[PDB]
Design a protein around this nucleic acid. Sequence first.
RNA 1: UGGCCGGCAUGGUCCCAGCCUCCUCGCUGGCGCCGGCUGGGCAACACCAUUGCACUCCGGUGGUGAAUGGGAC
Length: 95
Amino acid sequence: PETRPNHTIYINNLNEKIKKDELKKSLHAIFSRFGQILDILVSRSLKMRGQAFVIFKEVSSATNALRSMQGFPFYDKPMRIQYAKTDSDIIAKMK
RNA sequence: UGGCCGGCAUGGUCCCAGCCUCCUCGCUGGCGCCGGCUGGGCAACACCAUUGCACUCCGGUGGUGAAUGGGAC
Ligand SMILES: [Ba+2]
Ligand SMILES: [Ba+2]
């Protein structure tokens, strides 16, 4: 069953050969236009590699970003996007 | 040589260039032949495995089984 709208968009199918720092930067390069970004979390661990959590301030930003960038060719791969299952702490720490 | 040893071979010291490397990337490192013993680390790099929902850093294996010429005394 799909996920409900969230402040954070979960992206996967990312190019696993990109260093964390760079990846966080690049992502910001293409997602910033959708709205303020509280943070982007990336990990290259066995379980978390190839995915990312972009955390937008306003749910609409994520939503917009979701519908707009779905399937976007990034580092030679089609970016897959969804809403995160739950709220990232940064967001909890408020609403 | 990342630590360690054994065989053999080989006049010496400099100078310039080239080249090499997971473990002090460069001019007060190294760049004959052969065999065996062993430590560290995934930091980089490669390869294998992975499509994975986090907010705790964290899969595995591999490399040195490396690299030549010239010139001054
Ligand atoms: Ba060396
Ligand atoms: Ba690794």
